[PDB]
Design an enzyme around this catalytic site. Structure first.
Site, PDB file in Angstrom:
ATOM      1  CG  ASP A   1      40.688  25.339  25.865  1.00  0.00           C
ATOM      2  OD1 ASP A   1      40.628  26.386  26.323  1.00  0.00           O
ATOM      3  OD2 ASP A   1      41.211  24.416  25.950  1.00  0.00           O
TER       4      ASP A   1
ATOM      5  CB  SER B   1      47.911  25.848  27.033  1.00  0.00           C
ATOM      6  OG  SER B   1      47.476  24.752  27.518  1.00  0.00           O
TER       7      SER B   1
ATOM      8  CG  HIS C   1      42.969  25.084  29.166  1.00  0.00           C
ATOM      9  ND1 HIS C   1      44.329  25.266  29.592  1.00  0.00           N
ATOM     10  CD2 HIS C   1      42.805  24.426  27.775  1.00  0.00           C
ATOM     11  CE1 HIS C   1      44.922  24.791  28.491  1.00  0.00           C
ATOM     12  NE2 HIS C   1      44.270  24.316  27.640  1.00  0.00           N
TER      13      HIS C   1
END
Lengths: 301, 301, 301
Positions: A73, A147, A43
């Site tokens: 992910d 992230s 993402h």
């Protein structure tokens, strides 16, 4: 005491991700080898038209996207630079709840940031963020911008890739989630090799006993994977299972946990066949079946 | 292990600030010497008509405002009390990311509170809270009411004055910011002495190369401070620099970083003159210039 | 280092609470003895029609409610299971600010979760959550779902029952509150014994000197409990105190703190009488009085 030595070891191998799409986004990435391969979240780089990698020592460069795997992910990148620092690897298996860990990332674009906590829990699945989850939970402060950065143990060794958080406020409330290294290396190596991750397909959909019907033909809730549902094509409805069937073993392995059966099936190469024994009306029945391919498909709550 | 010994050393020298203006506000302050001088944030005591200081041992007293410096968000106070405990000083220079630290303050008026974290990062400037920033970043929980309290190292020695936080929710999400001791002592001593902090003035405004034009007369991005803009009066436009000029050295020192040039200029006493060499059309040109005075001008995001 | 050994000791004795009322709610509970008694918050099980207890080892069972005490926000439960793990007890008295502690609970229903912090403060009363408060404050991340779980010291010993938090965002901002063990054992033992907690009643309502009137007959603010108000029935207005009276001693003990006088009165059994000396118009006057019963009456801010 001090975690500075851990920081000094690991922080050089954690990078800041700037991405432009069509608009602008921040994330982190981990330098896995001196040859320039980098691990990050899907993402973060998904749909990016341009990915800049900024290293702790100040160099910047555009990154090429090796490939990506949305079901976990994860995504992989390659940069052309010499004398790259590389993250050392910890053992995801050897971590225990209460162990100290460090999160390294770019929260809110403030700059490379180290936060400290403990392992809050291991093996978190059922969360609902990704199809395949073996999440490490930490209370090291993790925020938007973390992230794809590194969760690292007290000695500096990578144990996870920070990916998501549970929060009522859009920022850290002490419940953050990292993908274990051992899982991330598996995904990283196929992507590097086959540009994607190849999983196997099987029609069945399953649930727990909820043993009112299963109390029938009673057992200790041992080795029983309840079946409910089938699917549209390349099905395993043509191998012999039906709604209501209950599976004691898959490929001669216990169906105690429906999570494990997801894993075995994904790791079975497409184009092969396999044997599952489910319990129908009180006697073990033996099936065997083929293997289809799986079709194609930071984060808050 | 335990940080109680650190707490026992330092907490007595951290005070609760109650201020009344014209209405009511909370903060913290640090007892710097047994003679009753206290360090705090400017945004805690600015505009107060009355400042009460409440010590850990229960005494209370009104404080006199020595003076204040908004460009760093510091203020100084003097109280008349005997047998005051005094904070010991750590070395801001010797701290490393990952070192453990403790924040001592009055978050939400709950009472003196100790929170624990690590140094997340050092030297944070470019944040946009104050004109002069050398911020220590910590993940020790810092909340409204922590302003002007002590960030302290694992042994109890003051390393910073907690001043601000970055947060989406109006409370701690693990990204807090403290003014380093070494900077705060500098500001504290002039205030105590001259009731304010005296800085020097210079017209120029600068930016990075962004070396498309600078690629012209190419160098390694070494010792080049790009100039853009000038100002209204007491200008340095009458010493010889112009928009577009590029400065290799200020007072015989490298212009590698525009932050450093802010610092040298502020620390040059008003009424003096100085020499800057900028690169014009491909050759070093030498200027010299005067020094003007600088005119007059917890926190979230 | 690592707190895993502490986690391994304590986590087995911390349970997940699911409650159904008339609808569904989550909390935590602590296994106090192998005989199946469990400690939790009152606001977790209050009004529940059914309480399920889920243990770390996977067993589940319905719990019976021994009894509850809302004035401290505690409740007790009994489960019928063999080979129960039991929490070890720390000394609430021996804890110091800065000591490390661990919170064990079910925040947001994510699953059993361990968070790490320090003791931020001890003895927090005046908060306004419960009538009787001796709160331990911690910066271990505590979130909705942590109620009734264990605050544990670095060796695994129970020091508190996590009950509430102060927060602007509905989740952890580093200010959480646990009921000390020593207080919780007192409440636990009467509930187990008498199904409730029996406290004593006394009409008086009190406040601090605010010594403008008390400056009259001046003293060092020593042993003076100011009286203001009386109540409707079973009053202590019929023993001799009046609005404005000031109390030096209760049951031959100093009235330095109005909190302590609440405690002595609650711990005096109903149906007995007692002696209080208040200072009226400049001379010690001696009263004696009876004892009434007290009538009947996680959490944010």
């Amino acid at each position: 005491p001090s975690y500075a030595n851990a920081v000094s070891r690991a922080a050089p191998a954690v990078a800041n991700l700037y991405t432009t799409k069509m608009e602008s986004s921040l994330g982190s990435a981990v330098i896995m080898s001196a040859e320039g391969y980098l691990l990050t979240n899907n993402h973060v780089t998904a749909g990016a038209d341009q990915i800049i990698v900024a290293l702790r020592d100040g160099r910047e460069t555009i990154a090429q996207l090796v490939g990506s795997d949305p079901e976990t992910d994860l995504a992989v990148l390659k940069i052309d630079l010499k004398n790259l620092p590389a993250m050392t690897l910890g053992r995801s298996d050897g971590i225990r709840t209460g162990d100290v860990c460090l999160a390294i990332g770019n929260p809110f674009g403030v700059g490379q940031t180290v936060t400290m906590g403990i392992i809050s829990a291991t093996g978190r699945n059922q969360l609902g963020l990704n199809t395949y989850e073996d999440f490490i939970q930490t209370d090291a402060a993790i925020n938007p911008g973390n992230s794809g950065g590194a969760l690292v143990d007290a000695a500096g060794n990578l144990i996870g890739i920070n990916t998501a958080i549970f929060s009522k406020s859009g920022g850290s409330q002490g419940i953050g989630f990292a993908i274990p290294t051992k899982l991330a290396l598996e995904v990283m190596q196929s992507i590097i090799e086959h540009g994607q991750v190849i999983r196997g397909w099987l029609g069945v959909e399953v649930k727990a006993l909820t043993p009112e019907l299963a109390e029938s033909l009673g057992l200790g809730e041992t080795a029983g994977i309840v079946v409910a549902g089938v699917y549209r094509d390349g099905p395993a409805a043509r191998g012999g299972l039906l709604p209501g069937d209950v599976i004691l073993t898959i490929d001669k392995q216990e169906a105690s946990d429906g999570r494990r059966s997801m894993n075995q099936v994904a790791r079975t190469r497409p184009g092969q066949k396999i044997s599952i024994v489910v319990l129908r009306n009180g006697q073990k029945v033996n099936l065997t079946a083929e293997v289809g391919l799986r079709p194609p498909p930071d984060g808050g709550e």
